[PDB]
Structures are given as structure tokens and as C-alpha cells.
């Protein structure tokens, strides 16, 4: 019942509106006449449908899902052909090397043009599409579908998925079918030497010979077999299913994932169900009454229900309570998920997405790399009035338990609460989750960039606090040398206090006030960083001293030192990567340069080009629409944090 050869782990890549959801749903319908991953069945194949992100830019989720699916269906709206948006979702497939087939959807829709599609695919994407199918009918007359591989035709009696008849190819479409058949063999001839031979002599190849060669080329990323239909009026879905099993890869056809032994060495992980367990956790979902569901793909070895596993990322042993397969209609409990297969593990306390599971006494290997994102975007949230402020913090602190990659700071100047994430999009869904599904209404603020403040020469300063009746006596007096630290060494404190000069009991108070003051620098009231303070002197007033006095004396001192230390602002600098059609190389580079950018070099990927760059996060507000309207919809970028830099003198004189 389990055969790797017969797994088909796919995802459905689709443009907004192209029909992703409707295609997926109809695929579940047809496979069901018998959720992060939904399993189903087709002619003795298990298809695991990986849910891909609902818009392309979600870059992390993207990487995580493409990694876990094997093949893919790309869906096109055959009224537009390939859109700007359809182009972006192709590049992702191209980017992550995932073997693909196309689906010309919406064939019943006015403007339905198969060839509008096929051409844009060769033309704009450099795709080498192959006509696997011919349509019978046009728009509202789109009646059926011809298969030019097997030279059989299909007709659909209704929009419902209820009437299908295998017909002979109408004589009227018989010339065109014969045309695209020999072209198909012509294509398969590039992948099978004995089909070439057979081609040359006018010998018809076997139906299998032909499928195998299409498959081989689809998988090696050399061709993109193309199919069509209407998901909405149920036409051609079964054939597309058919195609998934035909041409789309099993766990075996794609090269194996790589991971790192604990000695630092990189290994290919090979899909042996009787080899060592190794598995990636790639999504957590909090099922209502089943519990906290944690979705995995198993790369090698077997995962057995009731067993104990070792989480190698968070180095702690977990226990696998139940194993589930999520179907369309129901949940199915299973004893075991073998190499190449997928599902959900129940129980599992401290495992978050990214985490690697191995089998207790198996190699302590690590599949997914490190970097936690610097929280570079801040956002303020005035609640309602103590109203939604009630449950927001309660919902924040469990939401911080399937995302460790975002800060929560209470801003102590004006008062609001501060969430700090990595991207604008990061903060936007965290906001839709706040308001929609955890019922928090509030004044959500505008995305401000996480600026910092530091000094550029050493200082030698003092702070005092001195009260006399108001209403008892107060005294605190320190002296500090503050010097610059290297970029991102952060805070260092040193106590060069002699002996009794400041009584040992007050040093904490000094440190507290120093830290307290460093949360608001003098330039733009942002956090102070990368400095080394040394308390070297001071004084005290013998009755009148106190923790309060020394604390303030430290705030004071610290704030003064920053004003004096030729202070400067630090801003986040992003590593940006722009995917442009080659015709816009120049006009896109100039814009980047115009955002104080600095180019690192364009390597081509596909028939596209990919420009690398450094650009201040501050200048990236609305790059998405700027690119779109400078590549004509066809551009797409990815940003990742790199480092902090001094702002130019111009920008400081501006931010204040
Ligand atoms: N005419 C037509 N409309 C379709 C077809 N497939 C999907 N749609 C429509 O496209 C709209 C959005 O579809 P959806 O699957 O949500 O697209 P998505 O945003 O890319 O996920 C819906 O109104 C669907 O009814 C099709 O084959 N023909
Ligand atoms: Mg959708």
C-alpha cells in the first residue's frame, strides 16, 4: 500500500484569481468519490496537496512550502494568458527548481485563448511549453478536450462534473490533433534515443515510451507539459489529475534534501524508510479539540506513532502521541509516516516550524538553517480603552508561541504597545490575526523603521540628583566614561569605582537608571546601542543618598554622555534581490541607486535577470508597487536584513 514511486507531493501555484482555490477544491472533489497538507487518492497514487501561501510575497512560508512539495501545477487564467501575476509565481517555481506542469484554466470564460497562453509562456517566460491537449469548443461552447498523446477525445455533458464521455476525435479537429501529436513525439525524441530513431523512420512510438520521455523532460526542468480546462464548470480536471500522476515527480525523481551532521558536514538525505529518521516540521496549526497540530515531511526513515523523537534544533526529546492524515472531509489517524510522506503529529510540546525531528537514536542532523530576523519594523497599537486591551496581550503571548521571531515592547514615553517584526507583511498578518480571529479592535499605527542611536567619540560626563526637603533629602552623583563599541556589540558596563566612593549598595540603582535612560536617545528618542560605560568616580551625601538618587544620577549622566558623544543614528540596511525581465535592468537599477542603494551584481536566473543590492529599509516603503509600475507588473523582490549603518548627515538633519 506504501510505495514511494506512487507518492505525488504537489502544490498548486497560482496567481490571485487564476483559480488556485477552485482548482484545489475540485481536485479534492474528484479524488474523493472513493489544512497545511491535505491527502487524497488517484488511480492508486497518493497525492499530498501542500497548501502554498495565498499571495507570493510571503517569502519565508514560500521557501518552507516549496521545500516540502516536490512537483507543482502552475495555473494560468487563459483570458489574460500569463499575467504579470502569473509570471511572478512561475519565477518561484523556476527559482526553487520544482518540476511543473501548466493548467490553462477558465476556458469557458470569454477571452479563453489557449494559444495566447502557450505563446506568452515561450515568449515572456522562455518556457518550452508542450501542447499535451486541444480544446473542443471556444468559450461558452468549450465542450470537451482532446488528448494528442493517446489521440482520444473527451466530452463534458454539463458544467457539473457529472457527465463525461470518451468520444472519437471529431474529424473537424482531426487535422490539428495530428499536427500536435508529431510535435509531441518530436519533443519526446529529445529525451528518448529510441523515439528519435522511431521518429526518423515514421514509426509510431508506444504510448508508454512517450509518457516516460515527457515525464523525464518535465522533471529535469526541460519542458512544461501544458493542459487545459475550466475548474469552475468542471471540465478537464480528471485529465489534469491523470497528468499529475503521469508527469509529476515522486519523492524519488527530485534530488534529496541536504542537512548538516553535528560535526558540521553537509549530507544528502536519502529516502530510505528503513534508514534513520529525519523529518522537517514545516507548519503548526492549533486544531480546536484535537490539539496543537504540527505538520511534517519525512525525508528518510520511518516515523512511528507512539515513539519518541529527538528535536535537533531545540535539542530536547519529544513524544509522538498520535499521527494524522488530513483528508478533505475528515481526519485519519495512522500508525506511521514513511520516507517521502507527510502528515501531522499530535502532542509535541516544544517543536516549532523549522525544527528537525530524528529518531531518538538516529543521527543528530539539522535540515533547516539558522538566522532569526532582526525586528526591523516597529508598530504601535492603542487598544480600544482597556477593552480589547484586555485580551490582546493574552492573544499576543500565545501567538508568540508559533512565532518566536517578533518582539513586544511597551513604549515608555507616550504609552502604546509595540510589536516589532521583520517585514511590513509580517506585521500586517499579525494584525489581521489580532483584529479578525482574536477579536482585538484598536488604533493600529503606521510601520516605523527600527532606528537606533549611538556615539562616535568617547566622553567623560557626570549626573547628579539633589533634593533638599521635598520632602526628605536626596543625593546621587556619578562620573562615567562612555566610549563607542564596535557595531552591534551592544551594551557593556564596567565598574571602576574605587572603594566606598559610591557605596556598593547603590551601583545597581545607577545601572538601572542608565539602562532606563538608554531606551530613549536624544536625536529621535530611539534606543541607544553599541556603547561601553565605565563608572569611575562619584560622590554621596551620607544620610541623603538612596537608590532613587543614584538611579536618576545615572539616567542624567547617560543622557548627557550621548548628547556629547557626537551622536549618530543607526538605520537598518536590507539585502535586496530584484527579479526583473532583462528589458528593465537599467531603469530598475537607477531607482535602486535613487533610494541611496548600492548594487552587488546581476546574475541571470532563467530568462530573467536577478539584481543584488543594499538599500536602506527606510527607502523601501512601497517598493512593491514601484517595481510593479517600472517592470509593468512583471517584477518581484525579496528583502532580508543585513546590518545597521550610520545615516548620512543629510538624513539625521531631517529625522529631527
Ligand atoms: N470562468 C471561470 N472562473 C473561474 C474558474 N476557476 C475559478 N474561477 C473564479 O475565480 C474567482 C477566484 O478564484 P480563486 O480560486 O479564489 O482564485 P485565487 O485568488 O487565485 O485563489 C472565483 O470567483 C472563481 O469562481 C474557471 O475555470 N472559469
Ligand atoms: Mg486563495
Short mmCIF file of C-alpha atoms in Angstrom, two decimals, residues 60 64 67 260 313-314 352-356 366-374 404-405:
data_model
loop_
_atom_site.label_atom_id
_atom_site.label_comp_id
_atom_site.label_asym_id
_atom_site.label_seq_id
_atom_site.Cartn_x
_atom_site.Cartn_y
_atom_site.Cartn_z
CA UNK A 60 9.65 32.58 4.33
CA UNK A 64 9.25 26.40 3.56
CA UNK A 67 10.97 22.77 0.06
CA UNK A 260 24.24 19.11 8.44
CA UNK A 313 17.13 22.26 16.58
CA UNK A 314 15.84 22.77 20.12
CA UNK A 352 8.02 24.92 16.14
CA UNK A 353 8.27 25.14 12.36
CA UNK A 354 11.88 24.93 11.11
CA UNK A 355 12.57 22.20 13.63
CA UNK A 356 14.16 18.91 12.63
CA UNK A 366 19.87 19.54 11.03
CA UNK A 367 17.79 20.24 7.93
CA UNK A 368 16.88 23.93 8.09
CA UNK A 369 19.33 26.79 8.65
CA UNK A 370 19.58 29.45 11.34
CA UNK A 371 19.02 33.19 11.14
CA UNK A 372 16.44 34.73 13.44
CA UNK A 373 15.32 38.02 11.83
CA UNK A 374 16.20 41.31 13.43
CA UNK A 404 9.36 33.40 18.25
CA UNK A 405 10.54 35.81 15.54
#
